[PDB]
């Protein structure tokens, strides 16, 4: 059983320790091309990404899942360069990231567009998963969509359905962005269920931000896994809160439904570079191994439970294949 990766197919037994929600480069593509100074030196950016990810691999993570999609500045030829120079597995994603409306590109054709007819968004996702992204030969391993503050706008809803149908065609797992405080997981579960989606093939992201056990257990009950995936993002939820919710959930026997990450990156255009290392010093790829894991053991999370979240769960998730 294999899954596709920025360096081709790997045995799913070779996934190993997997962070289920990371990024390498995030940017608004058109702004970066037009105002390139902040990005600066392309080779330095790329080499820097390779350094950060190689370090991560040397520390004992085997795989990251990069959930950068359309709207987040996805550019796979640059990811191909990074992946070619690290032994870290990089799983790449397709889908579309919006809190509200869809790109102008979708404004004229498709369900709810000015004109319309066939959805064309789904086809684009399927092409990425099954054929490969652009000229690249790299296929997407996972689907990503979002629901935030605005909730189910017609744009957000169109994308959720496009992503649901791409998932039913290919069998690729869905990984989700949500606003946890507004409990947007429940919203996505509803749309997905209406689409006939097997909710156990869905990771609801950013549940790590929540401290509401009832909400998490309600998402699990419908079948989904939970992204405990913004470790280090302490402005949204302090270290202790993030560690406790995971600990509690393990004690309630939900380790088999949780995956971990930082939602970190090497570059994020929308924020001043020099400020973020001082305001969120723990927001990097090594925080889980340096701090979070020990703190978890301190709360009596077993080694078996950690293995489940970091190794067993991602592998199970990625071994479920084929559409329906
Ligand atoms: Zn997100
Ligand atoms: Zn993210």
Å from CA of 267 to ligand 1 middle: 15
Q: Are 282 and 232 in contact (CB under 8 A)?
A: yes
Q: Strand 63-66 to strand 25-26: parallel, antiparallel, or no bridges (unpaired)?
A: unpaired
Structure tokens at 63: 């795989």
Structure tokens at 95: 């889908």
Å from CA of 59 to ligand 1 middle: 24
Q: Which sequence spans correspond to the domains of the chain?
A: 1-324
Q: Which residue, among 144, 152, 143, 145, has the nearest Cα to 100 in the 3D structure?
A: 152
Q: Which residue, among 93, 104, 89, has the nearest Cα to 26 in the 3D structure?
A: 93
Q: Which residue, among 81, 80, 70, has the nearest Cα to 28 in the 3D structure?
A: 70
Å from CA of 168 to ligand 2 middle: 23
Å from CA of 183 to ligand 2 middle: 17
Q: Are 73 and 101 in contact (CB under 8 A)?
A: no
Supply the angle between the helices 213-221 and 184-194 in degrees, to the nearest 10: 10
Å from CA of 23 to ligand 2 middle: 6
Q: What's the resolution in A?
A: 2.3
Bridge partners (DSSP) listed for residue 212:
none
Residues 6+ apart with CB under 8 A from 30: none
Residues 6+ apart with CB under 8 A from 165: 119, 122, 195
What does the DSSP 8-state code read for residue 237? S
Q: How far apart are CA 137 and CA 171, in angstroms?
A: 19
Place domain 1-324 in its CATH homologous superfamily.
Metal-dependent hydrolases (3.20.20.140)
Q: How far is CA 155 from CA 13, 127, 158, 194, 199, in A?
A: 38, 21, 5, 17, 21
Structure tokens at 162: 């496009």
Q: Which residue, among 225, 214, 297, has the nearest Cα to 261 in the 3D structure?
A: 225
What does the DSSP 8-state code read for residue 140? P
**Solved with:** X-ray
Q: How far apart are CA 279 and CA 288, in angstroms?
A: 18
Q: How far apart are CA 120 and CA 118, in angstroms?
A: 6
Check the annotation: does 23 bind a ligand. Answer: yes
Q: Strand 2-3 to strand 10-11: parallel, antiparallel, or no bridges (unpaired)?
A: antiparallel
Cα 2 to the center of its chain, rounded Å: 19
> Alpha helix locations (H) across the chain?
29-34, 42-58, 76-83, 121-130, 154-170, 184-194, 213-221, 239-251, 276-279, 287, 293-298, 303-307, 313-319
Residues with CB under 5 A from ligand 1 (ion): 177
Q: How far apart are CA 178 and CA 184, in angstroms?
A: 5
Q: How many CB atoms are closer than 10 A to CB 21?
A: 29
Å from CA of 117 to ligand 1 middle: 30
Check the annotation: does 144 bind a ligand. Answer: yes
């Amino acid at each position: 059983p294999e899954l596709n990766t920025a360096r081709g197919p790997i045995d799913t037994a070779d996934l190993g320790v997997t962070l289920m929600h990371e990024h390498v480069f995030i940017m608004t593509t058109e702004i970066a091309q037009n105002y390139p100074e902040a990005w600066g030196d392309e080779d330095k950016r790329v080499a820097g990404a390779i350094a950060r990810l190689g370090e991560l691999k040397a520390r004992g993570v085997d795989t990251i899942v990069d959930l950068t999609v359309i709207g987040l500045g996805r550019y796979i030829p640059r990811i191909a360069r990074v992946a070619a120079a690290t032994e870290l597995n990089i799983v790449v994603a397709t889908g579309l990231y919006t809190y509200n409306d869809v790109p102008f590109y979708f404004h004229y054709l498709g369900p709810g567009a000015q004109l319309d007819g066939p959805e064309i968004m789904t086809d684009m996702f399927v092409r990425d998963i099954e054929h490969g992204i652009a000229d690249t030969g790299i296929k997407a391993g996972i689907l990503k969509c979002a629901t935030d503050e605005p909730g189910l706008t017609p744009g957000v809803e169109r994308v959720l359905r496009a992503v649901a149908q791409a998932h039913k065609r290919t069998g690729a797992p869905i990984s989700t962005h949500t606003h946890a405080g507004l409990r947007r997981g429940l919203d996505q579960q509803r749309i997905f269920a209406e689409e006939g989606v097997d909710l156990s093939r869905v990771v609801i992201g950013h549940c790590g931000d929540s401290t509401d056990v009832g909400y998490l257990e309600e998402l699990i009950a419908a079948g989904s896994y939970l992204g405990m995936d913004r470790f280090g993002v302490d402005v949204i939820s302090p270290f202790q809160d993030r560690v406790n919710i995971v600990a509690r959930m393990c004690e309630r026997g939900h380790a088999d439904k949780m995956v971990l990450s930082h939602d970190a990156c090497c570059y994020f255009d929308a924020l001043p570079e020099e400020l973020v290392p001082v305001a969120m010093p723990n927001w990097h790829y090594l925080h889980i191994h340096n701090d979070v894991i020990p703190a978890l053991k301190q709360h009596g999370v077993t080694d078996e439970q950690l293995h489940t979240m970091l190794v067993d769960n991602p592998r199970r998730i990625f071994e479920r294949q084929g559409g329906y």
